[PDB]
Amino acid sequence: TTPDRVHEVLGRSMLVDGLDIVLDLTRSGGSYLVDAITGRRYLDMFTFVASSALGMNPPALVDDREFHAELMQAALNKPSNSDVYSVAMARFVETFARVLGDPALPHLFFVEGGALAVENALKAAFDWKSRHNQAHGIDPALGTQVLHLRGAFHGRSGYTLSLTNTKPTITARFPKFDWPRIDAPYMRPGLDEPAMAALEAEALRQARAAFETRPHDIACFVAEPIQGAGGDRHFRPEFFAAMRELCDEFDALLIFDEVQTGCGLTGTAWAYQQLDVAPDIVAFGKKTQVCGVMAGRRVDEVADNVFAVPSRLNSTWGGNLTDMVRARRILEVIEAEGLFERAVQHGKYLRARLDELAADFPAVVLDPRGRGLMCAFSLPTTADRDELIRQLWQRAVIVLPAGADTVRFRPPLTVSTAEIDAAIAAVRSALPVVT
Amino acid sequence: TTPDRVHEVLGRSMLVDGLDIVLDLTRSGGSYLVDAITGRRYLDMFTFVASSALGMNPPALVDDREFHAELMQAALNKPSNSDVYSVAMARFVETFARVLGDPALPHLFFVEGGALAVENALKAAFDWKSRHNQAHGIDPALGTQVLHLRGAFHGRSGYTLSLTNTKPTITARFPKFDWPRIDAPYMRPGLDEPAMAALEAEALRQARAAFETRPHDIACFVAEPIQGAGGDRHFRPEFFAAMRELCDEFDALLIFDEVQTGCGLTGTAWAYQQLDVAPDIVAFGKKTQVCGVMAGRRVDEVADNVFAVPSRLNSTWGGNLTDMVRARRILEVIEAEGLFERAVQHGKYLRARLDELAADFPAVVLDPRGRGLMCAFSLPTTADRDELIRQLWQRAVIVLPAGADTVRFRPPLTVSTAEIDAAIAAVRSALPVVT
């Protein structure tokens, strides 16, 4: 079949509500997607929903002849990495620990899928809490609840469906656990030190209340260090530090969902390294191709936890070998070419450009925020927001909406300053058309 | 790193309880895995836990130069197929419908992971039931329960953790929904027409009881057409036909979990095609590389179900493009070379060989059963079973245990009769050593 017929063929079998183009797999490159139908090039600030670290067809992977052989060798088959090991797998794991590892979290576990990575993090926490309870003469049936935030997005699976609360179409009509949910004390425009502290104290009040009223039953607290789909909602390090302390007071683990924030986007390997808070478990995915968890800190206090006992966690494949080989090579490019620092430099620049926009359009471009390359701004009404996205589309710039009123930028770690300019230029163009 | 160091390197980051070999990705072929450490060749009746349809490095994929280009092109990147379409994706989907499609189930949906495929099937059923309830003046909060069997294995995720009940280490200490579970009236040795019917009626009694006592609240019934991990437990078509009728009487969908049984292993595309029972939804995975669901029959009776409304079901990637391209080529080999029929022919043969074993070792080789290439037998004690597996390992034959006392065969659809003989010969060898 032919590019112009892709939508017709798919449309026979599935709901076909994605983008209006057909990806040219060979001709897309860097920060540009190519439409196989028209040949048109689209500036990509979307990156497969922030899941691509280097953009399409990065030269270091495309030109590497030894890599082509390794990738091919891994792609022809799909071994069950859970029980059948290989050199290809071992190199991925050791380069993961070197480039993304945290010496406090030596336990690695791999799975296909972001939601199922968060889920294995929760499963780790449920087991930990039950056994810790048991070892302290508390009933081991206790320890089955997850403290989480409003506007959190953690996945669309059995357990994450009880955590995710953004658009109601994601969770409506699906069975949930009744788990304690608390307000998200994220930063807003026009709120100074005291007003922020007051707002956090209110979330902390709610957190402690939950801990006290379901005694020994809350296994952990999960959070995105910056809420993504919820609307690029950022939190002061102060908030998580209080949360960390409070999790310890009540013998709960703190888990961070870094599936969106992870792997360099914020300017460090993980966002948490900038908030100066130590998690017990971290869930990762998207940019890392394979998903999974890093665990340690208090997890090791329970000698027979889920990473020490066979068959507590498992999936058939244990992650996709091809993903593992690609991610390995991706991680080597990130390290060899200092892409974390490039994300800080270029994130300072994108942020600055959005400050200029906010100044030039004060009533329209609201709350320019960002950490590293992870930036957004808001519009007054959701109708404005949707119009700005359509306008950018017509000008061949792909961005992502979030929430009621947010436009988000998810550029590749390799975005150039010229490319950022091209995106901002397109926004300047579209703005008078929306007002 | 080097093959002899794979276990050491992995062992720093993860629990390392899999097989004792390092897979040679290039030199393994057909029904044989090669140990990269020793060069030893292992007869493979395990197939990455039944997830490989053609064995390692099948000649039709290895020699195909045009395919190498397509696979490479797909493997260099990991697009989000959920919103970015491609020719590569469209060919996979159309060849899936042609080779594995059922005209009653036109709705296809793809996801990475077996558990999450079953989960999307359940999510479809929960939505369907709530909205059907609503349209008939029943409360839409009702419809949140899943009827399922003892010894069922459906995955290790949020929802499937409430369904899976095999070894307690899979589910212990993880939060569950209280869902109605019923006995599995599978065939055993020495039970004729009447004794079987009596046993089914008892399961049916339990099924109806559950339906009547949680009115309008059971969204669906899930089953494996042949229970795999539970111990290759087979059911008479009569049982599912009564279940089908009973699901309709109470307005519940019948979902089949064909993740293990699927894609040719039983001699047809799906096992259900042999039981002459029509499911409303089918969950597939393993051999298909991409996982997902086929849906139709009563699902279409609810106009605004999960396949007609945007954003009810989703994952970031919508399945792995590389898996999709490989599976496409796999499906073409299955079709072009009549591998379904080859599975019937060679499954009749393996089955026959196990009948001979049962005769020669009547007190030891218990209950030789099988459908297509999906066969097993049992041993008297679990200690015998584990010893036979160790003995086969020493003789370089890989098989899979199941349950308390079962050895299962999961050969590639391409297994030769000589290879079956080699497996049986190894079993004959090991048996006197175990007694």
Ligand SMILES: *Cc1c(COP(=O)(O)O)cnc(C)c1O
């Ligand atoms: C997307 C994401 C996930 C879910 O990932 P999937 O691969 O779609 O299952 C979980 N948490 C966050 C913060 C994410 O952005």
Ligand SMILES: *Cc1c(COP(=O)(O)O)cnc(C)c1O
């Ligand atoms: C293995 C399998 C699944 C679970 O598949 P995963 O890929 O490991 O999540 C579900 N149901 C059955 C019958 C299976 O055999």
Ligand SMILES: O=C(O)CCC(=O)C(=O)O
């Ligand atoms: O299901 C969705 O809303 C997409 C979720 C997601 O990954 C995101 O947009 O951040």
Ligand SMILES: O=C(O)CCC(=O)C(=O)O
């Ligand atoms: O977790 C397990 O027991 C493996 C599950 C499985 O896929 C099987 O063995 O059939």
